[PDB]
Every structure is written in C-alpha cells, then in structure tokens.
Design a protein around this ligand. Structure first.
Ligand SMILES: Nc1nc2c(ncn2[C@@H]2O[C@H](COP(=O)(O)OP(=O)(O)OP(=O)(O)O)[C@@H](O)[C@H]2O)c(=O)[nH]1
Ligand SMILES: [Mg+2]
Ligand SMILES: [Mg+2]
Lengths: 285, 125, 65, 63, 51
RNA sequence: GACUAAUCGAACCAUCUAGUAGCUGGUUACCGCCGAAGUUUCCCUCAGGAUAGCAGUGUCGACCUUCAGUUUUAUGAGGUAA
RNA sequence: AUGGCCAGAAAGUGGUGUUGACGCAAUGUGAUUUCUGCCCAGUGCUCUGAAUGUCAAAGUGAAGAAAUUCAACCAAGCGCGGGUAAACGGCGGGAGUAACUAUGACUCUCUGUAGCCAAAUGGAUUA
RNA sequence: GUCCUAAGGGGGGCUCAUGGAGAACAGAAAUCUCCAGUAGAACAAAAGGGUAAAAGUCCCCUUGAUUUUGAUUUUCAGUGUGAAUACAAACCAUGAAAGUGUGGCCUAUCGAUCCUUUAGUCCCUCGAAAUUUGAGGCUAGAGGUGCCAGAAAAGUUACCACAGGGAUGGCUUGUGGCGGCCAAGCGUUCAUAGCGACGUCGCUUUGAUCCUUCGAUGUCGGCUCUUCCUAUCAUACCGAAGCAGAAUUCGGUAAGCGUUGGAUUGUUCACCCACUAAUAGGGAACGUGAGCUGGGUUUAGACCGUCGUGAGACAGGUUA
RNA sequence: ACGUACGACCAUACCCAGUGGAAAGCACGGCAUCCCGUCCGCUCUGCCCUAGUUAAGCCACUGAGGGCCCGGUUAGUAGUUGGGUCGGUGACGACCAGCGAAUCCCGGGUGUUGUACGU
C-alpha cells in the first residue's frame, strides 16, 4: 500500500472493533428469469446505499462450489449476497448468502411465487426516500422455534438485510415505512414479505392512530435448501467486541455525576460486647 | 487494607497519625504493628519527630508529635485536664484540683483514695 | 536548579537527594513521595497555584489558577 | 552546563486547550445542586472542571 | 510481538514520548529550528553548502 | 573482634628480600658555545596515547640551486566609502 | 550406635563416651503476669510416586583396514507430579452460579457515672 | 552525479494510448488541426466486473513535518502536573454546499583485519621408503547474527591500613514584578519609526477572623574582658505639628555617658514578664581556623525505626 | 399524446445513414459595460429573447450490417456425486436417484416509467 488512497482502502477493509455498515452484492447466474431480475431490482431499490451490482452471467452453483462467491466477496469487500437463478425444477430462486472472513458462513434459498409477485412500480403510492431506514415487524409462530431452522435463519437474513446503518438517535419523521415478514409454523409454509408506508392520524389521546398503505414489493417465498454454519465459525462470528468507550467495572470504584472517581469503604457493625473495660479501683464496691 | 486496595496503583499508601499529646498515637502504631516500634510514655510530648513504620509492604504508618491548635477560649486548666502539659513543671498545681473534683464523681474519688468527708479541695488534699 | 541534600550521621554524607530551588507547580491531588524514595524535593513554601495573567488584546490583568 | 532555553513556534500555543458546552455546564450545575455528602465514600481523583462556572454564587447579603 | 518489542519488554525500555520523538531540533550555530530527518534534514547537513 | 608477654579485623622471630610503587624526598667542581616548547593531525574518553612543530651535536654534498611572515605590478575577495 | 556432633596428613587414630532420649548436640527467645489480627500455598521444607525429559565415567552394539565416528542404555541431583516448619510471604469481606479440578470468570451488597460474659481476676499502666 | 515552497488532503477544469486525413523545414519517428476512438493510456493492485465531467492529468488553497481533551481500552511508571497506546470528541484544511480528509512508518546492539563454510584434480609437507585414510600449510571461492559462532569477573568497611596531597570583594543600604497608557526631553524630519525620567492604571475587614503555623545540606551559643563605628534607645541642645498645660510625635547636631535581670531546650531557643532614663544596632571570628565550656557533630561499645538476602548503609531517634 | 426540469431501471436505450416535426418548450443565436475566465468571450461567465432558423442538437419513424434483450428447444441430456441397487470371482453390464450445463436450432423485439410545470 504505497499510495495513500490504497492505504485508506486497506484500512477501511481491515477488521474493526465496531464494524462498518454491511454491503450486499446482487448477482445473477447463467440462466435467470425476468421475475427474479425484477425481485432483485426491488431489493436493490430497498438497499441502494450499501449494495453493489453485477451485470454479467456467472456460472456459479452455490450449493456445489462457492469458491467464486468467496473470491467475489474478497475482491469487492461485499459480505451479503443475493444470487438470482432459474431452473426447471426451481423456476425463481433467490439465494441469500452470508459471509464471515471472506468465506461462506451460511446460505439459504427462497422460492419466489411468479403469480402473486408485484413490483414497487405496481403500486401507485409515495415511495421510500433513498437511504432511509425502515422499521421491521416479524409476525407469526415460525420464528419462535426452539431449534435453529430455515425460518430462524431467514429472519436473521432479513433483519441483517434491512438493518441499515445503526444510530443512537432517530428523527421522529424517520418512522414512515415498515417492512413486515409473516410466517407460520406448519405442505411447506408460506413466508410473505410486504412493505407499508405509514399514515398517522388523530385519535383524541397522546398516542396517534396508525394507518398503512402498500408500498411494494409484494413477495411470497418458500424456504428451500439451507447451508448451516460450522459451530466454531458461528461462535467466532457471534463473539462480541467491547468498545473502548464501554468501561470495565471495578470493585468499589465508581464515577459520580461531577466526574470524580469515588471509592467505597466498608466499616462493618461495631460490636463492643466482647470488650472488657478496665477494672479500676474507683469502680470497685 | 481497603484503602490500599483503593490505591493499588501507587507503590504504597501512607497513614499519618494526628491528635493531641497522649491520646495514644504511638500506642496505636505499636498495637497495629504487634511490636513496640514507637516509644510510648504517659509523659506528654514523648514523640518529638516524625517516624515511618512499615506495617505491610504497601502500608506505612507515620508517627507525628502532638499538636494543640490555639484557641482564645482554651484555659490552662482545660489544657492540663486534657493532658497537654506535665504537672511537674506547672506552678501552683493545687489550683486545678477543684476542676478535677468537678469532673470526677464524688463516690468514685472516695473509693479511689479510701477517703471520705471533705468540705473542699484543701481539706481533701 | 538542584542543590544537594546530604543525609547520614557519619562525617561523610550521602548526596543522592536533590532539592528544587525554583518555584514549582505540583498539580491537584498531590501527595509527596515517602522520604526513602523522594529523590526530588519540591518544598511546600515554593509551590504556586495562581498567576497574574494579562490579556494583550483586552488590556486586563486577572489572577488565574 | 547551560542549555539553550528556546521555545519553538507552534500553532498549538494560540488555540484553546479545554472547552465546555452550555448543556454540559447545566448538567454539572444540576449535579452540584443535588450533590450530597456520604462519610463512607472517599475521593480518589478529582475531575478537572471550571468550578467558577459550575458552583453557585454567594448570598445576596454577602455580595 | 516483534524482536525489538520483546527485547524492550525484557530490558524495561519505555516508549519515547511524543514530544521527545518530534522531528524538530534547535540549531545553535544558525540560531534556527531544523528537522532531524526528511526534506532538508539534519542527517544530510553539508550536502549542499558551498564548501 | 575482646585476650593470646607494653605487639592483634590475625602474635613474635629469622628468611625469601636490596619484594613492588607510576607516589614523596634527595641526587656532589668551574668556565665556554648554542638553546626550547602547550589541539598541527589522527585515533571511545577518563586512571589515554602517539605525531607534526620548535633544539643540540656530528658529518657529507659543487655549502649547487639563491630564496624571503616585505613592498610594487597584474588579477581576485572586500564595490564598501566617495 | 554399622548413629549424631566434632577432630586428624593418615593410622590397628582421637574426643563426645566412665555417654544412651528426664540424654546429647544445635538454634531462637529470654523471670513471673500477658500473649498468639484471620485465611492460604507464591518462595521455600520434604515425598524412593511414576517418567526417561537432562543424563558423567565405566560397560554394550554397528560401520571401517584402523585411528575414529554413530547409536541406544544411562546413578544421584535437576525436571514433572504429591503433602507442609506453613518459616518467609501474600491476603478487605460475605453470597451465589453458566465454568465445573487447579487460576476460576460474571453479577449482587457490606457501615453502664460503670455492663455482660468468662476459673478472685479481666493484667504489659508488671512488683 | 545532479533537482525540488515535501508529500498528503480538499475543490475545479480537461480526457488518454492508438488509427485515418491535413500542415515550410519535418523526411517511419519533433509540433499543430480535425474525425474516429470502453479505456486497449496512466495510476494502484494481481478480477472471474479497479478507476473516465475520475482513483488519470493540470490548475487554486493549505503545507502548521505529526494538535488538544478524556474520570474510558491495553501496557507501563522509585521522575505517579502521569507516559505510551486504542477509541471518541473538539479543532484544523478545503469547498458555494452536500461533504471529504490528515494529524507518521519502523527497528536491540556489537565484529568484516570478524564468523560460518567449500574446493584443489596437474599445489607443498608429514623429515628411513611406499600406498590408502587422516592432519597441517598455501591458494582460490560462497554467505552474512532466523540457518554467522558468541557476547554474566558483585559488593561492603563507623573494626581498619598505606603512599601521597588539599583545606565574591571601592561588594552592600529605602522604597516589587509583569502588562498597558501618558510623557518633558533624545533622535527624526527623501522613512515618522524607534529610546524615554517624572507619573498613572490593572493583578497581587464598616476597625474582621482566631476551625488553613506549608520541610535544617548550610549552625549557633554562653561567658570573662577590652576597644571601635554611628546607621541615636536614653540623657544634652535645637526646628516643626491643635503642641493650652501634661504626656507626646516627626526631624536635626551629637558615640561625652549609659543601655539590666529573669522565665521558657517537648528546640531553627526565639519570644514573653518585670525593673528602668533607656533596656539602640553593629564590627574587631562567622571573607576556614589552640583561653574555658554546652549544641551543628559525626572513631571504636549499644540498640529502636527505614532500606538491604547479607556484610552493612541510612529519612532518622536515643545512650556512653 | 407532445415538450421542459429533476429522476428510476441503465444498449429493447449503443454504433451508422435517411425522412419528417402543428403548437409551445428546448436549441442554434445576438452583444462583451458590469460579475467572471481564457493563447483565443473556443469553453466558462455576464446582458438580450428582439431578428433569423429548424441546418444541426432534441423527438418520432424507416433502413442495412453488427450488437443487445426476452421465451421455447437443447434437456433433466452431457458431466459430477450418492455408490441406493439386481446379477457378477469382484470388476463390469444395467437400472434408482440428487445436483445440474453449454454449443447448435426456432420465434419475438430495438425502450418502459415516476414527480412537477406547461403545449
Ligand atoms: N487504658 C488505656 N490506656 C492507653 C491506651 N492507649 C494509650 N494509653 C496510655 O496513654 C499513654 C499514651 O502515650 P503514647 O502512646 O505515647 O501516645 P501519644 O499521643 O503518642 O503521646 P505523645 O508522644 O506525647 O504524643 C500511654 O502511656 C498509655 O499508657 C488505651 O487504649 N487504654
Ligand atoms: Mg506520651
Ligand atoms: Mg507518641
């Protein structure tokens, strides 16, 4: 890294205690249906700011060999993947691939319904501004499985996809769009993805009345093939780093509201019952 | 020990002992040490200079001479009954007996000296 | 800056201690090192906490900590 | 030996070293107002702060 | 841990302060402030003087 | 660390032994002819060295070439006064 | 007691020793009275408990024509693993748990104007 | 061996390599003009999709060469206003702005006349002769502290001993420092700057409080006795003050004559109480230094505290 | 439906040529005092919106050659594993599956669309 801009690029790609906002790459296979392309376009419109997009045909089958996927992740520093593909057995497939250290952490398949799919342009409403983070609502009994399954992994993928940029504060005007994922415990269950813009009205009390209007896209999914993570890799990925601004609690040491360091002392109960006073001559009868 | 743990960053802590003469500063140092390391006498002003005693590796004790903060309302009788001075070096020690007889209950004095029936400090002495 | 502080009861004295002969600022929460390990002596009579500071533009002089 | 007692030119000599905001001043004034004394707590490290701007003024009869 | 870092940890060699490691020194003979290294550094003194 | 024949943190006697010192003290007639010296340059310094320079006796060589802490002239630096 | 502590150049040498645990030798403290801040286990004290890990000389095997070289085997001590004079030393407590054994680690919170109890006395303020 | 107001950062403008057609010298290859030119140029990396009104190239601004703060992260600190480090925030640079960006990169040291290693067949010798191993010499190569070996000979003496050296000044005195302003004057009057006394202004309790005494390396004393100085406490004279008188106060000439007991050593022995006309201050030592005698003070004996494994040394305290 | 200003997909939109364009809007244009910038008012910037002009830009349509984008076929086939299997000395010859292509061939097409203001 002789060049300063290249050094900046490698320092941005370096591992950090607080990780960067997450980047997703949208790519296609050799054969991909137009409905699948429209679905990936809608997802890219949801996630424009932190996504990159390929435009060529890739001879990649992720469930056979994902070496090209790992190479693409290492080259583009992308770590979420949306792979579009079409086949006779599976006509409209969205392959959600999640990395960890430029290797495949886990994978999942979604099967798009060609009949009930409606794009964002199919709805005549006001759309979401670019870069706005929507809220998320997950509904149904399919996400409360005691054992990690396809629906739990899909909930993790969708939360990570619509995570956006975390922030400690949010404007109250940034609560106008919600993404709702509905899925039931069960032949295969139907996972439904909807997006709603929020209209708020008076109700005579402090809290307002919330009304929704469909914004798009309209997506129905069947969960298919799933590639589970290795337990050690999953433990290393779910390790939580501690910020230097997160202080380490010391015993009997605190900081008061004026910023002074305050120490605690403990005297204990005063027990003078075992004390024998002096037997003076004047105290004797 | 709690103070030493609160100041674990320093190499040690120093504990200086202050008070009037003959309150027991050197005796307290000797009791904490377990050994007669500071000179102890009932004579006021026994400790004249400051002294370091190593209690633990991280705890030092500092013996100090006895101080009397000056007050405009303090009497020589009050200082003598507080134990500031030596009674050998005071002039007319007899005048401070009424203060002692006021401070001490009469029956305690009677049983201390096996003596009953005085009308004043002159006759008691 | 430093004068030699001599220690010992012999006619020949140890001379490792140094005393600062100029005014010093010791800062807040100051506790002196114990005498067995106090090489540099900054006496309490030579410690200052405030100074008369002049603002060149405002043409004022205020005592400041 | 006598050294060369010289000061280099530097932009850091003409800048502010410590600054504080009005919200921080209000928070510290409220903390000073509601501060209480506890015999079983000791002071280990004082916070460097503008006490002249934080603590309250004197009584009007004294002023 | 590098060879120097291990040697300094074994030998008790403290890291230099940021004021101590500055690229600045006072030249008495010229009465000017000069750099220890780099462009027109003191390590190349006399490479461009006339004699 | 007292005593061990006025001798003790190691007795007295003789010998090796005229032990060693860079440190202290001293080192013996006269006249005549010369006659000095203190970073010059190199080496890790103090408890350091050589070395340049300055001198005296002898000689020998055609004691041959002449050279010179000086001025002038020509040309530099000081163009600075005027 | 085929011992301990010593001594001698050695000795078929001497002492302790004409001795034998109520003894001999070495230490520390230093009458009597008082007296053992609480708990460990880092340094140390000692356990022939398993190892060859280190592993000298002698001895064994192989190569070569030999000098020589290469191999195992390899005492004690050290090393590893156990108990302490717990002497030195460290040590602010009390509860929990998910660790499960050493080291744990992560939370919680802690402040009688002359009595009572002890085998007359409550002492070192010791004649 | 020469060159540079360094790199970096921000903003703005432009589009490259090449091919075709044109232009005095100019002719494959110099420069200029147009057209076509997905980058086939350049810059970074090692795409299987890096970058085109840019990440390329030139202009404008900064160049201040490694800022400040932190009760927070990690490591350290017998020199603990903490240091280094990570992170955060502020600042800073640029831009109209959205924004963007910086506030370093590394490393133990020592030999090269050294260390390790290789080869000689037709190199020399192994001295009674020959051959084969081996050894030495001589010569010529290779590499460079990961695989180039190695780089661990301390204290104390207050129990002592020997050889020697050694032991600022015609200063000082009564009136602060820093910053600003004024300023008679000095200079200057092709520059109107610069020195500047006398002054003045800022920082350093309604007769109060007494609940803030801020570090021994530096040593003084005491008798006994004599003399000198004046910078005069008293006594003598004098000038002035609401100084009525009395008692004073400020000042001048004046050293002729006096200037005292006593208490306190838990201590910088300096302050108290009294008598008195008054209880003035110094020098002749303290710019080293044999009258006597207590402290700084310190050979050998001894405990107690601190440090040290120890011999012992001291932050020290006590005794002879 | 057309135009303009911001856009979304980012060639069905790109490369080459021809024909036409009411209305208004874009555009070519005219002038260099001031703001501003160049070797050159070429570009950028300022003033005019009058006058000329649809010649070019722009839009629509057409036409080859490319390119590009969809659907079927290829084909559940080559190829890769399970090695499930029936026999077989065993191998092998065959079934049973799980993943899963591409070339070639056929057919269609050469831009849809959001907001605001106008014609
Ligand atoms: N009864 C009783 N007497 C005590 C106690 N503590 C001290 N004393 C006595 O009080 C006296 C105090 O003397 P020190 O120990 O020297 O105390 P000090 O205050 O340092 O004395 P100074 O040196 O003069 O300052 C001693 O003589 C003891 O006898 C106690 O706890 N109980
Ligand atoms: Mg006492
Ligand atoms: Mg005492």
């Amino acid at each position: 890294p002789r060049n300063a801009r290249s050094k900046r690029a490698l320092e941005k790609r370096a591992p950090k205690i607080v990780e960067n906002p997450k980047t997703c790459l949208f790519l296609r296979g050799t054969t991909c249906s137009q409905i699948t392309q429209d679905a990936m376009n809608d997802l890219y419109a949801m996630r424009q700011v932190h996504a990159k997009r390929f435009h060529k045909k890739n001879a990649i089958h992720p469930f056979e060999d994902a070496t090209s996927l790992c190479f693409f992740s290492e080259k583009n520093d992308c770590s979420l993947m949306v792979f579009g593909s079409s086949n006779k057995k599976r006509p409209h497939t969205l392959t959600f691939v999640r990395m960890f250290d430029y290797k495949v952490l886990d994978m999942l398949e979604f099967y798009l319904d060609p009949d009930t799919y409606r794009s964002i342009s199919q709805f005549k409403t006001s759309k979401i501004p670019i870069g706005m983070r929507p809220m998320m609502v997950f509904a149904g009994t399919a996400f409360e499985s005691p054992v990690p399954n396809a629906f739990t992994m899909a909930k993790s993928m969708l939360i990570d996809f619509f995570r956006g940029e975390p922030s400690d504060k949010i404007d109250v005007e940034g609560l106008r769009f919600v993404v709702v994922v509905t899925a039931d415990e069960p032949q295969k269950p139907i996972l439904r993805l909807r997006v709603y813009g929020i209209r708020t009205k008076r109700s005579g009390t402090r809290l307002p009345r919330v009304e929704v209007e469909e914004h798009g896209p309209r997506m129905d999914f069947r969960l298919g093939r799933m590639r589970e993570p290795d337990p050690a890799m999953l433990k290393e990925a779910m390790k939580k780093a501690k910020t230097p601004q997160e202080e380490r609690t010391k015993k009997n040491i605190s900081m008061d509201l004026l910023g002074d360091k305050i120490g605690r002392i403990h005297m204990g109960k005063t027990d003078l019952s075992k004390l024998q006073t002096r037997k003076m001559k004047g105290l004797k009868r | 020990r709690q103070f030493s743990v609160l100041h674990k960053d320093r190499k040690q802590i120093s504990v200086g002992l202050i008070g009037y003469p003959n309150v027991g500063k050197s005796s307290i140092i000797n009791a904490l040490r377990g050994k007669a390391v500071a000179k102890v006498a009932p004579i006021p002003g026994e400790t004249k200079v400051w002294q370091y005693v190593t209690l633990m590796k991280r705890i030092y004790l500092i013996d100090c001479p006895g101080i009397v903060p000056p007050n405009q309302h303090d009497t020589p009788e009050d200082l003598l009954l507080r134990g500031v001075v030596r009674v050998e070096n005071v002039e007319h020690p007899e005048q401070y007996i009424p203060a002692v007889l006021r401070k001490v209950k009469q029956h305690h004095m009677e049983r201390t000296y096996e003596l009953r029936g005085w009308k004043d400090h002159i006759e008691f002495l | 800056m430093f004068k030699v502080v001599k220690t010992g009861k012999k006619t020949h004295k140890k001379g490792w201690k140094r005393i600062v002969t100029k005014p010093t600022f010791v800062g807040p929460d100051f506790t002196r090192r114990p005498v067995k390990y106090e090489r540099f002596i900054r006496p309490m009579g030579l410690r200052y906490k405030k100074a008369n500071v002049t603002h060149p533009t405002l043409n004022v002089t205020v005592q400041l900590p | 030996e006598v050294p060369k007692a010289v000061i280099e030119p530097n932009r850091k000599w003409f800048t502010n070293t410590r600054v504080i905001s009005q919200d921080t001043l209000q928070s510290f004034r409220e903390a000073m107002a509601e501060k209480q004394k506890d015999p079983y707590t000791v002071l280990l490290k004082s916070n460097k702060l503008p006490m002249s701007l934080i603590r309250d003024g004197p009584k009007l009869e004294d002023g | 841990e590098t060879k120097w870092q291990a040697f300094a940890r074994r030998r008790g060699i403290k890291p230099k302060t940021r004021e101590q490691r500055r690229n600045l020194q006072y030249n008495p003979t010229t009465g000017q402030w000069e750099r220890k290294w780099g462009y027109k550094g003191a390590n190349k003194r006399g490479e461009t003087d006339p004699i």
